[PDB]
């Protein structure tokens, strides 16, 4: 319901992290997508806390090692997903009220995400 | 030659031939996505599924194109059930096809697009339209990946055109691509990272979506606007 | 209904009878027999000769017997003290080689000018017509203009730094003959209609 | 006959003393309705980001072909519009603009939104092919109006009012019964 | 010999000329019907030196080329133009005239300015009457010489020395 | 002598070059010479889309614009068999009749202007402005309109439309009368009009005249009755008629029409309620734009519609209609392209003009001006 909001707020959060890691390691970031519902929004209420629907971390070859996508506004089954290229690792962030934002059921933290990132970055290291 | 009747018209057309071609000769038509000129079919698009009588009717709609012909055959294409199904498959196709039309530069050449509008439309005279049954979030995957000094790749364009991968086998017999993950997780990639084949660029044309485009003319003009000037090459003695 | 005594006759004389499901009807005649046939109709109580549309079938994506075809629309004004509302077309395919045809000035003075237009726009000389002149176009431009063959006359539109558009390839538009970018078409893009 | 002649005069005489109904221009603003079609404005988001992407849908719609549009792909770091494509050149030849409105209907960014302008007229052909920056939601007048207002140093007015904005426009505030 | 070449005269006479504008409309289009509108019935023109609104160049020198035209009209218009007195102004009214709107065709004449020189364009088909007012206000101050172009560039106080006058 | 009355004169503004064979005090015959304007719309429109063609339709009728438009609309609609919502159809008649009134306003406005006393024009124009204000409201356009769209108009009415519409229906009856008041008495009116404008009903058909010329000679011939098309079937109203071909008769007819038109308005308002405004088959109709946001299939069809535009099937089509100016209709051959393979326009006024040397037999020289004017020339019919 309003789950939505905290999720969005979480999505920003996560994104923020993605940038941080990006700068931290100096690794390449690229915003991928923006909301359809921003484009074709044109007088109908927009209030999303960012404009960004999809964004990714790339190796420095334009090849991502990590993709990060939010669900759109009215697009049901609202979750945020991650997936590591060539790994078949598909992560489904739910939000759980009374907890926070959970990875399956385990609460996400930044470090979790960093660990995922480093193992990605270093392992797959396509370039 | 083989005695074919597609619906209301009969044609001779020698044997070993695809139903499909006789269909088009007959001035009857179907949506088509997998198989292509100068290339061995596969069943993959499954768009050429018809029913046939020879006189009974198959219990499973065979890809006409893939099947050979038969004398005394009836081919049914104006089938109500076909049309419904066409739409069906269309919808299925559209499930993750990312919305990008205005900036899609497959565009006027989005044959896919044209089939959609040709053969699609909900089963219901309407008093209210329908558009979907889908509503869940789409897949989000790979884009803005330069594939080559000439070719940009934004992956979620692909319909799983298998055409290019196929091309590489059929035509040069030199391969550089492959499907990667399985099922829905799948997607085509290279591991050449820049394809050192002397023939490559034709895939742009082959790509029945806008995944492989000429970056050099990316965001420079629109499909319809161009004058497509048939003329002659001289850059090789061919 | 006035129509019907024409219809049985038409059938009797074996003339092909076109019909659109929109309830519009043509009668395909030869040139020769037209005049008299049409004479008989006015006599049979055909009030009003509404139209003469000259047709150029230079390029068509189906075969037709002739390139030039005329079409009359005859009507019976029921609001008049005679008439039944009996409205129907007569089509008459026309040799390109002879752009002749006897007038129907003879049965309506409306015709006069109508046929004049048709000389201008398509090449047809209607036999037995006083005055051919353009009544609608220059006589300094020749070639019986408004034909498919006839030029379309475009000019590039101009924008800053001389940047221009050429209309005739700008268009994403098409004809049925035309294929566009697509290698084929079917479905909707081969037309569509409804019944529901 | 004769009676009438008198009656004729009668009514007109009523009207003579009637205080008239005409509106002076540009001394009381012209009355327009919100659906009115003036000079196209190019809109933007509150994100300060131009809506248009060089959609160029309009261009198929324009029967006059009144649009010269050079496209471009936005800066990734500094995108002039959030999109990945924008209109690197946006020209409109007003000398033949159809102001299709169908234009608006095709544009999906809703970039193009007819204005309330009509105060356009100049002496030179090529000045009347209005540019991008003249076609915004950020200008303060018509090209000649503005060009006058600098050399003269005078401010602006446009002499129209609507009952209220059209919802479609949502940037620029026009004089609306409360301006001129 | 036309009222110039002393400080006094030129401003005087120019005020005279500017304020007395006598429109001769050259309808052949929808423009006309809006033009009769443009005359009366909401707004006036008599306060801009116009009782002349009608067909004699023997009454006017303000040429309003109002409407989309054909080949057949070019020499005609030319000649009509010629049968005006020596100072004379050319309004090119509306899109239909000015550059041929939405027609690209042999029949038509595109870019009316071909046939005769122009000093004022006023686009829009239809335009608003009021735009025409704005235009003649332009044309007023234009012949007054208190005008430029959009590049600051000055210009003569007449339409009639861009091609030959007579 | 053969007198040469050239174009643009005096304020009659037909391109008219007229060879008047005179007796030096009478008209014998006029050989009209015309066609000094022309475009060849019919050509051009085969080089534009169907949607595009709707641009062209009001651009050849200064008067009742919407009728051309409608007639063309109908033809298309028939062809692919599309239907129109009832409310849509309501709106369509309203605009149509509003446009008829407009036409009449202009007809009589010009009538006065052309010759006779000049002034009342301006009053008729006041009303015209009112009408224009109504058009402005709903279509944002003074005239020329595109509000009508395929499947029905393209958006809902203003609420603001309702007050003003009532308002003007209040004023008009009285106003109409007062214009009429100028004519029927004024024994000079008689002496200018009655005798002239002669032509037998029989010859009206032979040379082709259309209603309000034909019905100006009181011959009942409403194409809205005879080939009744939408809504009018179920609307009462009668035919206004004269009973002889003269100027005199014409003039009075028109006044009566207006009153009929007003009752039709009145009827219409009753029959007006919410509803979709165009056909909801998105195959054939462009979709709502509040849904691009939503589905791909929307986006696809939308994109497609406004680019390529549909393919109607192969066919010829014609519908007869009653315009303000007479028998209107489009004979449209489509080959199933994105543009038609033939656009024939039935232009009534043009056919009505054929009857001019006839109409103007043996007439008197100051009278001949009026006799042209009385027939109503819109040059678009003629010139095309
Ligand atoms: S591939 Fe085709 S359907 Fe997809 S965005 Fe591009 S043009 Fe549109
Ligand atoms: S990239 Fe294109 S051609 Fe290749 S499989 Fe995908 S859809 Fe087919
Ligand atoms: S104004 Fe709209 S339609 Fe035109 S290019 Fe911009 S986004 Fe596209
Ligand atoms: S610009 Fe418009 S109003 Fe003027 S003549 Fe042309 S079509 Fe008519
Ligand atoms: S063409 Fe695709 S299954 Fe045959």
Swiss-Prot record, chain A:
Q: How does it sit in the membrane?
A: Peripheral membrane protein
The record's keywords, sorted A to Z, are: Cell membrane, Membrane, NAD, Quinone, Translocase
- Single Gene Ontology BP annotation: iron-sulfur cluster assembly
**Predominant localisation class:** membrane
- Domain comment, as recorded: Has a similar fold to the mitochondrial iron chaperone frataxin.
Q: How does it assemble?
A: NDH-1 is composed of 15 different subunits, Nqo1 to Nqo15. The complex has a L-shaped structure, with the hydrophobic arm (subunits Nqo7, Nqo8 and Nqo10 to Nqo14) embedded in the membrane and the hydrophilic peripheral arm (subunits Nqo1 to Nqo6, Nqo9 and Nqo15) protruding into the bacterial cytoplasm. The hydrophilic domain contains all the redox centers. Nqo15 is bound to the side of the complex near the N-terminus of Nqo3, where it interacts with subunits Nqo3, Nqo2, Nqo1, Nqo9 and Nqo4.
Protein purpose = NDH-1 shuttles electrons from NADH, via FMN and iron-sulfur (Fe-S) centers, to quinones in the respiratory chain. The immediate electron acceptor for the enzyme in this species is menaquinone. Couples the redox reaction to proton translocation (for every two electrons transferred, four hydrogen ions are translocated across the cytoplasmic membrane), and thus conserves the redox energy in a proton gradient required for the synthesis of ATP.
Q: What is this protein called?
A: NADH-quinone oxidoreductase subunit 15
Organismal lineage: Bacteria, Thermotogati, Deinococcota, Deinococci, Thermales
Whichever gene encodes this chain, its name is: nqo15
Curated annotation (Swiss-Prot), chain B:
Gene Ontology terms describing biological process: ATP synthesis coupled electron transport
- Where in the cell? Cell membrane
Quote the record's binding site residues for [2Fe-2S] cluster: 34, 45, 48, 65
- Translocase as a keyword? yes
- Annotated [4Fe-4S] cluster 2 binding lies at 158, 161, 164, 207
Query: Which parts of the sequence bind [4Fe-4S] cluster 3?
Result: 233, 236
Any one GO CC term of the record:
plasma membrane
Q: Which domain of life is it from?
A: Bacteria
Per UniProt, residues of the 2Fe-2S ferredoxin-type domain are 1-81
Q: List the disulfide bonds.
A: none
Q: Which UniProt keywords apply?
A: 2Fe-2S, 4Fe-4S, Cell membrane, Iron, Iron-sulfur, Membrane, Metal-binding, NAD, Quinone, Translocase
Q: Where are the transmembrane segments?
A: none
Record-stated family: Belongs to the complex I 75 kDa subunit family.
What is the annotated quaternary arrangement, including any partners?
NDH-1 is composed of 15 different subunits, Nqo1 to Nqo15. The complex has a L-shaped structure, with the hydrophobic arm (subunits Nqo7, Nqo8 and Nqo10 to Nqo14) embedded in the membrane and the hydrophilic peripheral arm (subunits Nqo1 to Nqo6, Nqo9 and Nqo15) protruding into the bacterial cytoplasm. The hydrophilic domain contains all the redox centers.
Entry note about domains: The subunit comprises two main parts, an N-terminal [FeFe]-hydrogenase-like domain (residues 1 to 240) that coordinates clusters 1, 2 and 3, and a domain similar to molybdopterin-containing enzymes (residues 241 to 767) whose first subdomain coordinates cluster 4.
What protein name applies here?
A: NADH-quinone oxidoreductase subunit 3
Q: Which organism is it from?
A: Thermus thermophilus (strain ATCC 27634 / DSM 579 / HB8)
Gene name for this UniProt entry: nqo3
Curated annotation (Swiss-Prot), chain C:
User: Which terms in the Gene Ontology molecular function aspect does this entry carry?
Assistant: NADH dehydrogenase (ubiquinone) activity; NADH:ubiquinone reductase (non-electrogenic) activity; quinone binding
Q: Name one GO cellular component term.
A: plasma membrane
InterPro entries, per the entry: NADH_DH_suC, NADH_quin_OxRdtase_su_C/D-like, NADH_UbQ_OxRdtase_30kDa_su, NADH_UbQ_OxRdtase_CS
Q: In this UniProt entry, which cysteines form S-S bonds?
A: none
Q: Does the keyword Cell wall biogenesis/degradation apply?
A: no
Name the keywords, alphabetized. Answer: Cell membrane, Membrane, NAD, Quinone, Translocase, Transport
Query: Which superkingdom?
Result: Bacteria
Enzyme Commission number(s) from the entry = 7.1.1.-
**Its topology with respect to the membrane?**
Peripheral membrane protein
Free-text function comment from the UniProt entry: NDH-1 shuttles electrons from NADH, via FMN and iron-sulfur (Fe-S) centers, to quinones in the respiratory chain. The immediate electron acceptor for the enzyme in this species is menaquinone. Couples the redox reaction to proton translocation (for every two electrons transferred, four hydrogen ions are translocated across the cytoplasmic membrane), and thus conserves the redox energy in a proton gradient required for the synthesis of ATP. The Nqo5 subunit may be involved in the stabilization of the complex.
Similarity-based family: Belongs to the complex I 30 kDa subunit family.
Q: Which HAMAP family match?
A: NDH1_NuoC (MF_01357)
Q: What's the protein called, per UniProt?
A: NADH-quinone oxidoreductase subunit 5
From Swiss-Prot, chain F:
For whether the record's keyword set contains Membrane, the answer is yes
Q: Where in the cell is it found?
A: Cell membrane
What Gene3D superfamilies does the record point to?
Cytochrome-c3 Hydrogenase, chain B
The catalytic activity of this protein is classed by the Enzyme Commission as 7.1.1.-
Q: Domain of life here?
A: Bacteria
Q: Which reaction does it catalyse?
A: a quinone + NADH + 5 H(+)(in) = a quinol + NAD(+) + 4 H(+)(out)
Where would one find the signal peptide in this protein?
Answer: none
Q: Which family does it belong to?
A: Belongs to the complex I 49 kDa subunit family.
User: Which Pfam families does the annotation name?
Assistant: Complex1_49kDa
**In the UniProt record, does the keyword Acetylation occur?**
no
What is said about its interaction partners and assembly?
A: NDH-1 is composed of 15 different subunits, Nqo1 to Nqo15. The complex has a L-shaped structure, with the hydrophobic arm (subunits Nqo7, Nqo8 and Nqo10 to Nqo14) embedded in the membrane and the hydrophilic peripheral arm (subunits Nqo1 to Nqo6, Nqo9 and Nqo15) protruding into the bacterial cytoplasm. The hydrophilic domain contains all the redox centers. This subunit interacts extensively with Nqo6.
SUPFAM superfamilies, from UniProt? HydB/Nqo4-like (SSF56762)
Name of the protein described by the UniProt record = NADH-quinone oxidoreductase subunit 4
One cellular component term from this protein's GO annotations in UniProt: plasma membrane
Q: How does it sit in the membrane?
A: Peripheral membrane protein
Concerning InterPro entries, the annotation shows: NADH_Q_OxRdtase_suD, NADH_UbQ_OxRdtase_49kDa_CS, NDH1_su_D/H, NiFe-Hase_large
For this UniProt record, the keywords arranged alphabetically read as follows:
Cell membrane, Membrane, NAD, Quinone, Translocase, Transport
Which GO terms fall under molecular function for this chain's record?
NAD binding; NADH:ubiquinone reductase (non-electrogenic) activity; quinone binding
């Amino acid at each position: 319901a309003s789950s939505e909001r905290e999720l969005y707020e979480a999505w920003v959060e996560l994104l923020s992290w993605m940038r941080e890691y990006a700068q931290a390691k100096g690794v390449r970031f690229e915003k991928e997508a923006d909301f359809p519902d921003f484009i074709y929004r044109m007088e109908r209420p927009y209030d999303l806390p960012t404009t960004i629907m999809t964004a990714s971390l790339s190796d420095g070859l334009g090849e991502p090692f990590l993709l990060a996508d939010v669900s759109p506004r009215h697009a049901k089954l609202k979750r945020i997903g991650l997936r590591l290229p060539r790994a078949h690792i598909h992560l489904h962030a739910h939000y759980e009220p009374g907890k926070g934002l959970v990875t399956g059921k385990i609460p996400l933290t930044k470090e979790r995400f960093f660990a995922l990132a480093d193992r990605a970055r270093e392992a797959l290291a396509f370039a | 030659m083989v005695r074919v009747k597609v619906n209301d018209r009969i044609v001779e057309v020698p044997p070993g031939t695809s139903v499909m071609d006789a269909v088009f000769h007959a001035g009857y038509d179907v949506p088509l996505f997998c198989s292509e000129k100068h290339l061995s079919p596969i069943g993959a698009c499954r768009m050429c599924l018809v029913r046939i009588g020879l006189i009974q009717w198959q219990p499973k709609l065979a890809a006409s194109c893939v099947t050979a012909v038969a004398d005394g055959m009836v081919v049914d294409t104006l089938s109500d059930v076909v049309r419904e199904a066409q739409a069906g498959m269309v919808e299925f196709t559209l499930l993750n096809h990312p919305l990008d039309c205005p900036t899609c530069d497959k565009g006027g050449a989005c044959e896919l697009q044209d089939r959609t509008v040709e053969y699609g439309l909900y089963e219901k005279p309407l008093e209210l339209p329908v558009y979907t049954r889908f509503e869940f979030t789409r897949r989000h995957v790979d884009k803005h990946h330069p594939l080559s000094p000439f070719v940009i790749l934004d992956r979620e364009r692909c319909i799983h055109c298998k055409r290019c991968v196929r091309y590489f086998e059929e035509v040069p017999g030199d391969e550089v691509l492959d499907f990667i993950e399985r099922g829905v997780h799948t997607f085509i990639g290279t591991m050449d990272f820049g394809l050192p084949s002397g023939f490559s660029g034709n895939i742009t044309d082959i790509c029945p979506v806008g995944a492989l485009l000429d970056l050099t003319a990316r965001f420079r003009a629109r499909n319809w606007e161009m004058e497509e000037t048939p003329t002659t090459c001289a850059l090789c003695p061919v | 209904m006035r129509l019907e005594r024409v219809l049985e006759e038409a059938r009797a004389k074996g003339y092909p009878i076109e019909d659109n499901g929109l309830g519009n009807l043509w009668v395909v005649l030869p040139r020769e027999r037209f005049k008299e046939e049409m004479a008989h109709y006015k006599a049979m109580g055909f009030n009003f000769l509404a139209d003469i549309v000259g047709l150029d079938y230079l390029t068509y994506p189906d075969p037709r017997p002739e390139r030039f075809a005329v079409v009359y629309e005859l009507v019976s004004l029921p609001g008049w003290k005679d008439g039944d509302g009996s409205r129907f077309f007569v089509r008459v395919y026309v040799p390109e080689e002879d752009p002749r045809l006897p007038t129907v000035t003879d049965l309506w003075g409306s015709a006069n000018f109508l046929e004049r237009e048709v000389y201008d726009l398509f090449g047809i000389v209607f036999e037995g017509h006083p005055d051919l002149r353009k009544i609608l176009t220059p006589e300094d431009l020749e070639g019986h203009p408004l034909r498919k063959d006839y030029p379309l006359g475009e000019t590039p539109t101009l924008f800053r730094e001389g940047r221009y558009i050429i209309p005739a390839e700008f268009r994403a538009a098409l004809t049925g003959k035309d294929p566009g970018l697509t290698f084929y078409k079917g479905g909707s893009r081969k037309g569509y209609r409804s019944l529901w | 006959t004769l009676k009438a002649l008198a009656q004729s005069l009668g009514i007109t005489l009523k009207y003579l003393f009637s205080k008239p109904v005409t509106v002076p221009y540009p001394d009381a603003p012209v009355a327009l309705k919100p659906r009115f079609h003036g000079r196209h404005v190019l809109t933007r988001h509150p994100n300060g980001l131009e809506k248009c992407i060089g959609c160029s849908l309009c261009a198929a719609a324009c029967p006059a072909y009144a649009i010269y549009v050079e496209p471009a792909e936005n800066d990734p770091e500094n995108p002039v519009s959030a999109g990945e494509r924008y209109a690197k050149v946006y020209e409109i030849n007003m000398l033949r603009c159809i102001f299709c409105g169908l234009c608006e209907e095709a544009c999906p960014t809703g970039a193009i939104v007819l204005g309330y302008d009509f105060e356009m007229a100049d002496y030179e052909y090529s000045d009347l092919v209005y540019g991008k920056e003249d076609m915004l939601v950020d200008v303060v007048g018509t090209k000649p109006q503005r060009r006058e207002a600098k050399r003269t140093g005078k401010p602006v007015k446009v002499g129209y009012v609507v009952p209220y904005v059209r919802p479609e426009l949502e940037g620029f505030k026009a004089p609306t019964e409360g301006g001129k | 010999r036309e009222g110039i070449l002393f400080t006094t005269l030129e401003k005087l006479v120019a005020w005279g000329r500017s304020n007395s504008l006598w429109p001769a409309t050259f309808g052949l289009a929808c423009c006309a019907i809006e033009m009769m509108a443009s005359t009366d019935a909401r707004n006036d023109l008599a306060r801009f030196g116009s009782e002349v609104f009608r067909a004699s160049p023997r009454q006017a020198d303000v040429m309003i080329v109002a409407g989309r035209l054909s080949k057949k009209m070019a020499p005609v218009m030319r000649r009509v133009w010629e049968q005006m007195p020596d100072p004379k102004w050319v309004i090119s009214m509306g899109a239909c005239a000015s550059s041929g709107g939405m027609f690209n065709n042999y029949a038509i004449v595109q870019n009316v300015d071909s046939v005769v020189p122009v000093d004022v364009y006023v686009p829009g088909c239809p335009p608003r009457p009021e735009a025409l007012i704005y235009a003649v206000m332009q044309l007023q101050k234009k012949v007054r010489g208190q005008a430029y172009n959009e590049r600051g560039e000055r210009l003569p106080p007449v339409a009639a020395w861009k091609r030959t006058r007579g | 002598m053969t007198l040469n009355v050239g174009p643009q004169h005096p304020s009659t503004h037909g391109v008219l070059r007229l060879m008047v064979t005179l007796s030096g005090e009478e008209v014998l015959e006029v050989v009209p010479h015309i066609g000094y304007l022309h475009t060849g719309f019919e050509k051009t429109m085969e080089h534009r889309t169907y949607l595009q063609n709707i641009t062209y339709t009001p651009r050849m009728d200064y008067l009742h614009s919407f009728a051309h438009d409608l007639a063309y609309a109908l033809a298309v609609e028939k062809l692919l068999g599309a239907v129109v919502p009832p409310r849509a159809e309501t709106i369509r008649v309203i605009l149509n009749e509003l446009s008829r009134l407009a036409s009449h306003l202009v007809f009589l406005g010009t009538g006065l202007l052309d010759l006779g006393a000049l002034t009342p024009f301006f009053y008729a124009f006041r009303e015209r402005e009112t009408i224009l204000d109504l058009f402005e409201w709903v279509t944002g356009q003074r005239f020329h309109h595109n509000y009508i769209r395929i499947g029905g108009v393209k958006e809902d009415l203003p609420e603001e439309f309702v007050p003003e519409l009532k308002k003007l229906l209040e004023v008009l009856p009285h106003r109409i009368d007062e214009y009429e008041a100028l004519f029927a008495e004024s024994p000079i009116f008689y002496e200018r009009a009655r005798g002239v404008g002669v032509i037998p009903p029989e010859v009206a058909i032979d040379l082709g005249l259309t209603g309000g010329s034909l019905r100006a000679s009181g011959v009942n011939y409403d194409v809205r009755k005879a080939y009744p098309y939408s809504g009018y079937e179920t609307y009462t109203f009668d035919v206004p008629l004269g009973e002889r071909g003269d100027v005199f008769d014409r003039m009075l007819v028109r006044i009566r029409e207006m009153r009929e038109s007003v009752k039709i308005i009145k009827q219409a308002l009753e029959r007006l309620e919410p509803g979709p405004v165009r056909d909801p088959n998105p195959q054939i109709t462009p979709p709502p734009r509040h849904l691009l946001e939503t589905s791909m299939e929307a986006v696809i069809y939308h994109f497609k519609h406004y680019t390529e535009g549909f393919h109607p099937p192969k066919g010829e089509v014609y519908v007869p209609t009653e315009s303000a100016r007479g028998e209107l209709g489009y004979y449209i051959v489509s080959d199933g392209g994105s543009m038609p393979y033939r656009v024939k326009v039935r232009a009534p006024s043009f056919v009505n003009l054929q009857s001019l040397p006839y109409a103007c037999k043996g007439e008197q020289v100051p009278d001949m001006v009026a006799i042209i004017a009385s027939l109503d020339p819109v040059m678009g019919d003629v010139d095309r």
